[PDB]
Amino acid sequence: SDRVAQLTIGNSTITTQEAANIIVGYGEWPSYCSDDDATAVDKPTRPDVSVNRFYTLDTKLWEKSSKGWYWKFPDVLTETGVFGQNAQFHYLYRSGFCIHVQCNASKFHQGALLVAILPEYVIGTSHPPYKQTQPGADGFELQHPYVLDAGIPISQLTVCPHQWINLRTNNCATIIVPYMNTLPFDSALNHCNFGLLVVPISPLDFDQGATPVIPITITLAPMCSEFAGLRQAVTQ
Amino acid sequence: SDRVAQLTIGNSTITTQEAANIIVGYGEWPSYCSDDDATAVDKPTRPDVSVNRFYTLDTKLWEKSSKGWYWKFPDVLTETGVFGQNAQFHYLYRSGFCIHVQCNASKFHQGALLVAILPEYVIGTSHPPYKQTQPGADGFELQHPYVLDAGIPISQLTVCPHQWINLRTNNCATIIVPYMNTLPFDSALNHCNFGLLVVPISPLDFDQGATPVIPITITLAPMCSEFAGLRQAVTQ
Amino acid sequence: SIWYQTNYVVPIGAPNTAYIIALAAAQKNFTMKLCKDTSHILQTASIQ
Amino acid sequence: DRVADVIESSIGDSVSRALTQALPAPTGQNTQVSSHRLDTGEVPALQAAEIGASSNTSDESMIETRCVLNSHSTAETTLDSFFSRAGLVGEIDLPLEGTTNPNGYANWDIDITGYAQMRRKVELFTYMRFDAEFTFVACTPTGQVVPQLLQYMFVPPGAPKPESRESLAWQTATNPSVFVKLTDPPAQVSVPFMSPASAYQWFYDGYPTFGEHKQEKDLEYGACPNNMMGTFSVRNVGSSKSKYPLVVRIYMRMKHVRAWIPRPMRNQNYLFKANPNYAGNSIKPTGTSRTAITTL
Amino acid sequence: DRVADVIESSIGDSVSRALTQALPAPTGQNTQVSSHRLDTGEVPALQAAEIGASSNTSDESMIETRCVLNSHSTAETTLDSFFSRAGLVGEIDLPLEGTTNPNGYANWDIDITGYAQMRRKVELFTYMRFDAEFTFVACTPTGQVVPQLLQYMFVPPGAPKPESRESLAWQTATNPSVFVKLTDPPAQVSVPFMSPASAYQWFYDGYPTFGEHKQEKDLEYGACPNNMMGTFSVRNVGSSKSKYPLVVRIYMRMKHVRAWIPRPMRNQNYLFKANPNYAGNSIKPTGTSRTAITTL
Amino acid sequence: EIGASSNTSDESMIETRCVLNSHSTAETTLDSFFSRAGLVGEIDLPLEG
Amino acid sequence: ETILEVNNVPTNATSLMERLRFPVSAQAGKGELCAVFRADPGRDGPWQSTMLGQLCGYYTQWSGSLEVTFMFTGSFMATGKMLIAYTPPGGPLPKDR
């Protein structure tokens, strides 16, 4: 009664039979803004179910050579579903997320995927492009996973909301994160509160013959969505 | 203290200095759906301020020969603002409206405009096109105003939520209408609960010299907006 | 931004063009913090 | 714990404001005595229909009236007291010779917009909920009462519709059928309000398909499936020929009526069924015309 | 009156769930006596980091431990007890000859990402709120103490920045300025947490412009205006030449510290200021390397 | 035209929310403003001139 | 409230007084744009004239809503209706009413 689990938000439901439990970012659930932490004088919009639902976006293929990938939440979801609209129509944004990275295989396969969250995920390279800093859907790929393309050791990434997908045990990870920023609200069109990294620490291996197509899908869901500063529709 | 007035919804505010008061459609304010009148088993979305706000769309030019125009509410607003999105993303729709048709002039001008609401506004002609039945923005024009292009006498239209804009007295009309349909919800993409008609009963006249540009603008605002059946985005 | 909802209607015998004046101020919930020298004006020549 | 905004927000009021209450009214209002009145500030007569309200001026404030006790009842001006009257709405023809209805059977579509008289009244409102009572008058094109036997069968939308004078569908194991002789009095039938919609819709300003609405498909604009009650079938109970030229006329009466939104009366001549299309090439005035507004 | 859905909906909870409470911890945990244990169902050692939790296994359940009273205090491993230590973060050069700072004045941009030592520590967290105390060590390139007078003036973002050794901006009628001789001890200054943001941001994953973000504008990615404290100006109080080669070094200490999100330490050598750019052509291991994982 | 600053408040203009202004107005006071050293005089006692 | 110089284009020194006023003629089309300006007080924009604006120059940061009243000076017979909008940060200058 610890491996099986179900997630129900909006009009979406997720299932699992090899889950390794749920982790709550820094032990805190997504809460709305207090009437003292906010400065935006105007009742925001809490569409709820229409935006606070599960969205299955991108999928990648794990290989015996894959380096790793990453995404930028605030931006990623935009342009898709009712959520994207509010993010583009409104100026101020606020919300927490429920991430579910699923990746199954057979009992004859082996591999270990580290799935962690990194707040204010800045990258280096002498300045990365917009297609690298905000690769919304379909994300981007790591070139130097050892330094997370930022100059920091990945061996010390577990110091953040993380979880592992060791094929020999579980087949999916689940994280819950509350809004994070030195401000009550902030436009997600140009600022990403954090990013998701998926890196194979244990190279996916398996004897020839077993289906080599090992996909890794990403499914997330907004929580306690609040938008303010209603204006014209914007894209970036 | 009866001519001056102010309407405040969402982040919009309307003003007037020659209003003739406000009329409430069939003496009833826009209310949400009861938990017994609804059959749609799923908590709808009440975005409120984000959609329940004032929208100034089309404008027309009144002339000494103008016949009249008309619009189809459910459809009209779609494709514009946050409202349009919910209408296109969701299947079921529900809402009441606050209409404000403004048209000013000088004390030396003369004219009388009848502004009424007509539920389930069907038209004839042996079958009108989609560009005539649902002329959303910029509406459509009446060819035979005497029969309202439906075969019914306009002399008997006052039997519905109406109001007059007699330039010699007022310069704007205001109507409030609750959801109207033999059902709790209904997709506004293909069905219009009603329509707005603006016909000059007293031909606009004025001696030469006075600014002949007499515009008539339309401004409406949704009320108690509720959407259900969240799905893929649709247009028609 | 400012737009014409309708039109500047005028009778026969009145100015065909008028003017408007804008007055600005802050609301009660207004508050300033910190401080510095003004950059809105700078003296070119020294006081005589 | 509460953002206050959530506490205040009235969002979720299933209760309508109303602001207008229905009161008893058996007898028309009774007039009361009224003396002269000469004063400033009081302008009963002066109104401003520019607001959209029917002048509330009363006789008394206009002329020195007397007292009258209105005994005149308003019971005949009610919904039931009005609509609840039998009327022609259907008419089927099962002749011996012709191209219309050979074979001996006939499938009539359930729609009443085929006859003026009735259609005029009903199209006064936008919505209407109610039960009805149908009567069937079967007879030959002359008025001849013939000793023939028939079978009226109701075919709900989605049920097998008879294809021949002897189609299997006439076994009517589930559907409701009625067998009567033309010698026996007309058929008496009670029909309940059957419709997915809470009330029948006279005017449907939209499309039932939800597709592209191409021009060739403008044949759907106005068609509401909530008014589609299926069809009505009738035939002679036999394997051979009818032997007689028959004509059935369907009459309807409404019981337990509930009308809602009221709209303007009909101004032009009806052309199509379930289509507000009018005679555009030749439109006539709502009423009679005169020679001068200053002459009778 | 209520749709029930509105009554249930918890939407609007400004209160965070928490589920984790901070407790007192002056002395490290004290170990307790532990005897042997041999049983099934109890697997203290067996864990599954695949969940994302640090093994909660305690010494006792692993080996027959004794009892120990940990008196070891954890007061020096606190935020203030750590960050609250003066360190080099700034350095200005006002030489007599050269192209760097002629004229006798110098406008330094307020940023501490210019020096390793300090930058390493601070970049451990994502956010940080606090006050600071700055000390100013002025001296010549040799260590020579000169009888020169200077004027340090703070120039907030939006305030007139001095353009010359005698610019009007030095009247400092509003701005805060400090006059000191190189003979007097260093300058002692206390600075409050000044920022529109509730806490300074070390990493800004976004753009401050909100425009097109063209390639030539990728110079903004990471730039957060909430860390822009304006500039710092310094010059000799005179109309003529300084007469001396000077070099000011700015040291900072933090008071009342409040750190939040923690991130991995720095792995590579810093290259630019306010830029996590690293030596991509030559990356080095986090630590020392060996010859074999089976040999020391 | 009367000579008074519009007393219209945010609430009567748009559907506002609730906010607790903690922003202090102690630095916008007289002393907190003027009480700052500044150049007002300057004398010159040169050898030559 | 102090006079806001929106129409700050003229600088003739003979036409510096019209910087305070504002033009509003009898257009003809639907949806004309009459004026546009920055919403920042302490900015070098039109808010330079306003007392509030000049004060800000002495402070680095601020907070609060802002009121701006518009008074029509035209003839009494002059009638009209106009839409004054405010596009929150992030929203580019609108091109349509």
Ligand SMILES: CCCCCCCCCCCC(=O)O
């Ligand atoms: C069983 C008797 C039920 C009577 C319902 C008649 C409704 C006919 C209305 C037709 C209107 C239309 O099809 O658009």
Ligand SMILES: CCCCCCCCCCCC(=O)O
């Ligand atoms: C008055 C002393 C205030 C100290 C604040 C220093 C903040 C510097 C951070 C620079 C980071 C950046 O610019 O992106």
Ligand SMILES: [Ca+2]
């Ligand atoms: Ca993809």
Ligand SMILES: [Ca+2]
């Ligand atoms: Ca993007």
Ligand SMILES: [Ca+2]
């Ligand atoms: Ca138009």
Ligand SMILES: [Ca+2]
């Ligand atoms: Ca349309």
Ligand SMILES: [Ca+2]
């Ligand atoms: Ca004139």
